[PDB]
Amino acid sequence: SGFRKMAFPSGKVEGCMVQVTCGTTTLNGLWLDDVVYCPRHVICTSEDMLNPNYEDLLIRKSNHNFLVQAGNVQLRVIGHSMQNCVLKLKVDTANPKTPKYKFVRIQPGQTFSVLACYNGSPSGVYQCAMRPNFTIKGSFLNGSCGSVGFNIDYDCVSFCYMHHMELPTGVHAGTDLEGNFYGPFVDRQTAQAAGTDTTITVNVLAWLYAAVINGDRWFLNRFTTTLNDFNLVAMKYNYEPLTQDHVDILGPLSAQTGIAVLDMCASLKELLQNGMNGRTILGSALLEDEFTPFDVVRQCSGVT
Amino acid sequence: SGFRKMAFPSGKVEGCMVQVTCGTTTLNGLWLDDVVYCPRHVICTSEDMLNPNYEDLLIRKSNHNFLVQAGNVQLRVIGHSMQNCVLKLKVDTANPKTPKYKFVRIQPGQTFSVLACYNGSPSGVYQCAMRPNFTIKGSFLNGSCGSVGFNIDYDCVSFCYMHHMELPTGVHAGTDLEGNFYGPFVDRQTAQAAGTDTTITVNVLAWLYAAVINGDRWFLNRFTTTLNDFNLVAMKYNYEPLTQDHVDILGPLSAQTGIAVLDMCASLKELLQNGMNGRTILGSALLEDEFTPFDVVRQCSGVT
Ligand SMILES: *CC(=O)N[C@@H](C)c1cc(F)cc(Cl)c1
Numbered sequence: 329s330g331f332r333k334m335a336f337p338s339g340k341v342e343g344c345m346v347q348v349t350c351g352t353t354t355l356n357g358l359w360l361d362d363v364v365y366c367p368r369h370v371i372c373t374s375e376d377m378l379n380p381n382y383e384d385l386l387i388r389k390s391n392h393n394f395l396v397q398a399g400n401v402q403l404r405v406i407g408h409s410m411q412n413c414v415l416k417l418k419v420d421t422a423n424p425k426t427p428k429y430k431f432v433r434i435q436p437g438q439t440f441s442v443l444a445c446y447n448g449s450p451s452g453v454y455q456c457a458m459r460p461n462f463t464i465k466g467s468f469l470n471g472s473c474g475s476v477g478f479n480i481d482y483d484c485v486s487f488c489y490m491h492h493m494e495l496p497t498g499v500h501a502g503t504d505l506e507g508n509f510y511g512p513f514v515d516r517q518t519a520q521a522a523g524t525d526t527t528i529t530v531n532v533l534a535w536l537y538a539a540v541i542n543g544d545r546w547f548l549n550r551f552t553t554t555l556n557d558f559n560l561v562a563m564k565y566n567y568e569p570l571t572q573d574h575v576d577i578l579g580p581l582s583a584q585t586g587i588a589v590l591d592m593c594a595s596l597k598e599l600l601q602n603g604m605n606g607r608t609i610l611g612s613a614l615l616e617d618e619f620t621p622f623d624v625v626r627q628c629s630g631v632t
Numbered sequence: 633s634g635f636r637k638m639a640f641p642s643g644k645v646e647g648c649m650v651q652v653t654c655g656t657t658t659l660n661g662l663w664l665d666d667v668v669y670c671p672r673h674v675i676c677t678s679e680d681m682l683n684p685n686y687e688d689l690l691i692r693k694s695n696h697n698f699l700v701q702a703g704n705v706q707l708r709v710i711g712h713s714m715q716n717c718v719l720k721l722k723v724d725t726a727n728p729k730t731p732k733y734k735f736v737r738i739q740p741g742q743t744f745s746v747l748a749c750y751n752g753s754p755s756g757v758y759q760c761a762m763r764p765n766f767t768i769k770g771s772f773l774n775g776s777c778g779s780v781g782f783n784i785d786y787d788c789v790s791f792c793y794m795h796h797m798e799l800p801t802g803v804h805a806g807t808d809l810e811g812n813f814y815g816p817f818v819d820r821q822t823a824q825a826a827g828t829d830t831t832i833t834v835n836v837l838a839w840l841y842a843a844v845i846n847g848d849r850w851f852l853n854r855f856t857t858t859l860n861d862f863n864l865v866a867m868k869y870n871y872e873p874l875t876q877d878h879v880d881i882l883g884p885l886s887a888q889t890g891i892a893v894l895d896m897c898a899s900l901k902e903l904l905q906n907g908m909n910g911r912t913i914l915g916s917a918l919l920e921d922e923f924t925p926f927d928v929v930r931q932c933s934g935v936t
């Protein structure tokens with residue numbers, strides 16, 4: 329037992345990290361098969377970032393201007409193209425460590441692991457969720473651009489995020505591996521503000537089920553509620569509305585614990601209205617929302 | 633910017649995980665060079681665990697009774713020995729993926745990453761601290777025995793923990809890689825209780841410095857204190873006493889932020905006495921103590 333914010337083992341992704349340099353700008357790239365993916369702003373100077381015309385800046389770049397280094401060895405770039413906000417650099421060598429992979433575009437509320445990298449070298453791994461305002465709260469310093477987010481289904485890595493930028497409020501924005509930003513963000517040094525960062529209700533419920541499985545049961549109340557009644561309280565507290573799709577996904581946790589989904593909603597409603605009163609749940613003094621129902625099942629069952 | 637509970641990239645350790653089976657008992661082993669390390673209770677039945685005599689149970693075991701599987705291939709065991717609470721199985725093949733490594737015995741308050749494994753296969757990675765009562769609060773299910781804790785200094789893995797057991801209160805106990813338990817725990821199914829789980833004061837201070845670096849400054853107060861005065865409050869709140877050695881280690885964070893260590897102690901004293909008043913620091917409603925001063929420096933500087 330015990331419940332931790334756990335990331336996927338990062339080895340399969342570490343084997344894909346490379347350094348990409350264009351002129352004086354260096355960031356990370358993801359090398360899968362014979363293609364290196366990286367943020368297109370690798371072609372920009374600090375001045376270019378204020379109002380970049382990427383197609384125009386790219387005209388001044390040839391294959392030899394992109395320096396790709398894997399470990400301490402240079403890869404030969406034989407092609408390059410821009411797809412949305414990412415560049416795809418075709419190299420002459422397939423990555424021998426390419427895992428089985430997919431590119432997926434996730435929904436808000438979904439979680440993933442980030443392998444933060446600098447100069448193509450991994451520094452650490454942590455667990456994130458795509459916030460309902462399409463930002464992530466990561467840990468990214470200058471040069472972390474190009475670090476990726478992913479999930480693993482046994483031996484298949486599903487890449488869902490590539491880091492591009494930090495908003496003036498310190499939250500993060502990036503794209504899927506097709507180069508499309510999550511949310512309305514653009515890769516430009518212009519002030520962009522995030523919308524309301526609401527709480528991912530289905531994830532808090534999943535985490536309350538993890539708490540019961542792990543022996544933290546004090547918050548269990550004697551009430552039940554309905555979706556409509558719960559959602560009136562969710563709205564007041566800036567929680568995401570709960571739908572029958574979320575109730576369906578919590579079914580296995582409801583089955584394992586014998587606690588009906590709506591009863592757990594009623595316990596959450598009381599926690600929102602009464603607060604924690606200085607108590608903790610799974611060592612947290614706030615309601616955690618960065619575990620999906622699948623994450624809780626996975627961690628409580630021991631999937632490898 | 634942003635500050636996350638970050639684990640070391642786990643690839644170097646994933647390449648060392650194997651499955652060890654003795655009779656009907658299966659757990660994880662760590663394969664480094666031509667030796668596989670695993671908890672000695674791999675030789676026990678459930679009945680043996682109530683009062684095991686390990687030297688006696690080991691007399692009934694030969695090299696061929698230990699089945700070691702790396703991926704889906706069997707390793708040949710050519711020797712075996714018991715060192716404290718671990719078995720060392722000499723195999724005929726050196727692990728080709730053996731990273732540069734050391735075995736270290738950590739002090740309470742020190743943090744490390746755990747690669748939780750089942751059947752020799754990695755399930756996830758998370759960050760722990762050795763608690764002041766020599767337990768860790770991990771996430772370990774049946775079969776996680778043998779999973780290891782480690783730190784990385786660039787390309788050298790320092791293994792500090794091997795998981796052995798869960799106390800009846802759901803906290804975890806294990807050994808260093810020489811088989812010596814942290815704390816007073818024994819590898820027997822007998823009720824063993826943990827001592828006071830005090831808060832690692834030097835780590836909370838480090839995390840308050842991380843909060844200031846990352847823009848969370850509301851808790852900064854207009855006071856200072858002395859070590860003796862602070863420690864009177866630390867004692868009352870079950871925090872570890874702060875020594876000049878801890879002040880010395882916080883020096884670089886004090887230098888980077890311009891906040892004297894004793895002034896940060898005074899801000900922590902006010903947080904202990906006043907509480908958070910419903911506010912958060914780095915997204916937490918409690919004072920986090922599982923980041924050392926070195927972890928904060930590393931994460932805020934981008935070490936790979
Ligand atoms: C990774 C990162 O933060 N890159 C910087 C240079 C940046 C700034 C900016 F205004 C927009 C983008 Cl996409 C990237």
Ligand SMILES: *CC(=O)N[C@@H](C)c1cc(F)cc(Cl)c1
Pocket residue numbers: 673681774775776777778795796797798818819820821822
């Ligand atoms: C990894 C684990 O929990 N192993 C179990 C079988 C166990 C039980 C016990 F009472 C003592 C030890 Cl060391 C291990």
